[PDB]
Design a protein around this ligand. Sequence first.
Ligand SMILES: Nc1nc(=O)c2nc(CNc3ccc(C(=O)N[C@@H](CCC(=O)O)C(=O)O)cc3)cnc2[nH]1
Ligand SMILES: [Mn+2]
Ligand SMILES: [Mn+2]
Ligand SMILES: [Mn+2]
Length: 157
Amino acid sequence: MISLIAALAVDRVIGMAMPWNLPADLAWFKRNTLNKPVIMGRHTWESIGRPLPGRKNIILSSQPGTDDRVTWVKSVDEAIAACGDVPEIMVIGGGRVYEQFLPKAQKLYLTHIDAEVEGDTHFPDYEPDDWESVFSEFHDADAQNSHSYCFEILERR
Ligand SMILES: Nc1nc(=O)c2nc(CNc3ccc(C(=O)N[C@@H](CCC(=O)O)C(=O)O)cc3)cnc2[nH]1
Ligand SMILES: [Mn+2]
Ligand SMILES: [Mn+2]
Ligand SMILES: [Mn+2]
């Protein structure tokens, strides 16, 4: 089962380009991806800098791999197969990779951040008749979190 996990600014802007400081969102991301395979695009891999620990890291790119610490694939179907038989595969972006996996996804984990950010890459426009919000948790900005944030889980319907 494929899930997407993303942090979205106002108007669904993604944002590689690091507009906020949300330690609570990083903990949410870690909690929801721990011990699951993660699929990412190459610019997201370069941003992270080093493999996410305790997780098979799969990079989807059309060009040959340049780091033996991660697994490199060239297609969606190869990326899924490289995950093996796990209960849940986590797709961690960026925008093009989210579009590649959205039609197969059954679950979205979204953090909505009340930040206006000039990026031009948007999360795909998921519609109500395909996606039922099943969990939401709102937080105000505080001394350790720069902006308000809202954790949402949606399930395909
Ligand atoms: N909700 C959410 N928040 C994000 O920041 C996020 N980021 C990406 C991809 N970008 C990144 C960038 C850094 C790390 C990262 O360094 N994660 C660490 C957290 C603490 C640490 O640095 O060790 C991890 O272990 O998961 C993950 C994803 C994709 N979906 C997201 N989804
Ligand atoms: Mn890019
Ligand atoms: Mn605002
Ligand atoms: Mn339906």
